[PDB]
């Protein structure tokens, strides 16, 4: 299969009665349902184009960032993706200015390296308060930069799970000339994002489907097996 449409079963659909004309090419006239659905053919060619583009960028060792700040399910999953193939990720939001420079990143990553190479000796040799504080900023570097500790430079690409859930992220993305790929809903704005992905994110099934799509795009790029999008097996994974 190649992102087969038969498997596609909860990608059409989103929240009700908040859409804008920017999605007018994505939605047919509505009376039957009122829960804004999508068009199958258009999403198919758009997703094929996105897959081909990310693979082509990814042969030359491009860097991709993931927005891991939706509940838990997609979060732990994209944690797994960002871990087996080692690239940058986050588990918490940007606090603003997280993607604008590197000095705040550089001093932070040096602090992390010093911490991991130092506290491996100290558990009770220093004060108890020292142990608690060091574990605290361990947790802190895990919250923000334990998902990103390998930047030669800020990532060449990124995926946004939901832009109307991460206005700030797509804002800094549009500030820079960096190419941008992001999911799109009927509340999102597919006029500031560079790559359109008209897929739902409220239901975790769609999130994990596009999740596997990107994971397989980045996997075959660096000679890694491909669990879906080339496997005729219908994606079996169920919600938790």
């Amino acid at each position: 299969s190649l992102a087969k449409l038969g498997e596609m079963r909860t990608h059409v659909g989103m929240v009700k009665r908040y859409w804008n004309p920017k999605m007018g090419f994505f939605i047919e006239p509505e009376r039957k349902h009122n829960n804004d659905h999508f068009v199958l053919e258009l999403q198919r060619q758009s997703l094929q184009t996105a897959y081909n583009y990310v693979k082509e960028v990814a042969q030359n060792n491009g860097q991709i960032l993931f927005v891991g700040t939706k509940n838990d399910y997609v979060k732990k999953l994209v944690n797994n993706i960002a871990k087996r193939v080692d690239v940058a990720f986050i588990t918490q939001r940007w606090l603003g200015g997280t993607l604008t420079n590197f000095k705040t990143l550089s001093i932070s990553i040096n602090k992390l390296n010093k911490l991991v190479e130092k506290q491996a000796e100290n558990a009770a040799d220093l004060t108890k308060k020292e142990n608690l504080m060091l574990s605290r900023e361990i947790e802190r570097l895990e919250k923000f930069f334990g998902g990103v500790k390998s930047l030669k430079r800020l990532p060449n690409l990124l995926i946004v799970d939901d832009p109307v859930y991460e206005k700030n992220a797509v804002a800094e993305a549009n500030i820079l000339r960096i190419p941008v790929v992001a999911l799109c809903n009927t509340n999102t704005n597919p006029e500031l994002v560079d790559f359109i992905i008209p897929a739902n994110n409220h239901q975790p099934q769609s999130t994990c489907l596009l999740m596997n799509l990107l994971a397989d795009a980045v996997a075959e790029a660096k000679a890694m097996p491909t669990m879906f999008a080339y496997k005729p097996d219908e994606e079996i994974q169920i919600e938790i």
Binding site: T49, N52, Y53, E56, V57, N60, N156
Partner: peptide
Amino acid sequence: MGNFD
């Protein structure tokens, strides 16, 4: 257009 290198 894609193919960013």
